[PDB]
Design a protein around this ligand. Structure first.
Ligand SMILES: [Cl-]
Ligand SMILES: [Cl-]
Lengths: 298, 297
């Protein structure tokens, strides 16, 4: 079956009004919520989370609809898979554990939940880290020929159902491995623990999990963009101290210099590149863990 | 099996140095070459070609690599599927028939061959008509969120092999029907003759034909864009009289006001909207045929 990649961590199914959140929980200390993105699950943190668990109570959650979390039924506006809704559902989940103020690090889609959480509900966060993203608004505003070729999946996966779902279902293994490999520094699967790849492949093998991922990308092209547009045009900035980490060969640094962009969105932001492709916690786990431990311990 | 949608047209395999071009030929009078696009074949003209063959020798060709035309081997720059190379191949095809000066109408990819041909070899054309396109340069320069979502296949099908080939193989019958339906005004397949859909569906079922289509879109993102950019930067304009027709619900009108764009590209252009989605000759065959005969005659 599927390997346990978090030796010593407990497992929790947290009930919320939108379905259960699955999480691994370990460590002790101030609470720290870790959110994955696409096409992964909470196991992508397995190389970094033990180092964090030395200092923090580490909650490694599957996003709503991902991994082993429940999949709320979507609707015409992709509501449960908007980052606004995911953020609210994770706030509820954390409250079930007694965590009403916590630290948060997210990667990829999870990072988008994270900065939206900080915009909507900043009082819930002590500190925020985002890994290898710019805000959704900024990717769309910078969508020229070169970038449309680089992140074509932003507009492919956002096509109306069931178009991407039907194409993905012919050979799901190929696509999940293709995306994992294409966004790494090396362009192959060598950075990943094969036991982790199996987790990602098995999640992607479920047609309803694939649909959820497309709903996430549809939200990303519509409501998420519109929520971000409101904030940027209103000049609303994230007031929580934040860390922006990005991969020197990752996605965010394509088509913008990341710290300059985040300075427009956040009043107190620091950042650093890491020699890595998109998948910082797996491609560069020691470097990522150190940056996060330093930031959240300050 | 496949219906003959061009009663009284002959069927020719035209040899060129890059492979054979399939065409239906009918009519008499001045020569007029009609070029289809994606994901179709020459049969998309079946409702309009008979009206044109009243006045013209109508040659209804499958693009290089499409339909029953041969598929030249591609290379790392997608050369045979660049519009420049497709245009040269079709010029050679027409010379085989003794046509060195001819009228030309194209739709979708075939219209991209056509305006590239008009830029490269304008002495070959008496008149040019392009259906529901803007130049490739213009699509890419207008790339924004709205357009990226609308013409997502421009960046999806240009991804390196074998990504789009493998995904298209996931459900090819669904994909080709989805493209046909989604770009019509009706949003379904009711605008199409079912026998024509069978033609499109059967060509799309061949993986090698699907690969060529991706090669076409790869050329469309790279060399075709570069070739257009040179002409824009040099201020080169199409000197052939041209007609730009577009669908009121079609693709070209999403990016811009099509006649204002074409006036930047052509010194003598007229144009009009047709009450139609993208597939003008099938969604609106009478309006399309009328406009073509009036312009070409
Ligand atoms: Cl992302
Ligand atoms: Cl086109």
């Amino acid at each position: 079956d599927l390997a346990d990649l978090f030796p010593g961590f407990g497992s929790e199914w947290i009930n919320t009004s939108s379905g259960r959140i699955f999480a691994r929980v370990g460590g002790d200390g101030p609470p720290l919520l870790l959110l994955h993105g696409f096409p992964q699950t909470h196991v992508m943190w397995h190389r970094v989370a033990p180092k964090l668990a030395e200092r923090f109570k580490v909650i490694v959650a599957d996003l709503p609809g991902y991994g082993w979390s429940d999949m709320p039924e979507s609707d015409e506006q992709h509501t449960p898979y908007t980052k606004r809704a995911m953020a609210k559902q994770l706030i509820e989940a954390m409250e079930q554990l007694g965590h009403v103020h916590f630290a948060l690090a997210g990667h990829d889609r999870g990072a988008r939940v994270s900065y939206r959480l900080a915009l909507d509900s900043p009082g819930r966060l002590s500190k925020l880290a985002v890994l290898d993203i710019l805000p959704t608004y900024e990717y769309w505003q910078r969508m020229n020929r070169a970038y449309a070729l680089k992140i074509y999946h932003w507009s492919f996966l956002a096509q109306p159902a069931p178009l991407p779902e039907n194409l993905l279902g012919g050979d799901p293994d190929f696509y999940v491995k293709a995306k994992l490999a294409s966004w790494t520094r090396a362009g192959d699967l060598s950075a990943f623990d094969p036991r982790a790849v199996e987790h990602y492949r098995i999640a992607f093998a479920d047609p309803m999990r694939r649909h959820v991922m497309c709903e996430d990308y549809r939200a990303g092209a519509y409501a998420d963009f519109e929520h971000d547009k409101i904030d940027v045009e209103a000049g609303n900035k994230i007031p929580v101290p934040m860390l922006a980490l990005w991969g020197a060969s990752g996605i965010a640094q394509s088509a913008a210099t990341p710290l300059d962009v985040w300075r427009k969105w956040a009043s107190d932001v620091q950042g650093a590149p890491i020699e890595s492709g998109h998948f910082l916690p797996e491609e560069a786990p020691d470097q990522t863990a150190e940056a996060l431990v330093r930031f959240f311990s300050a």
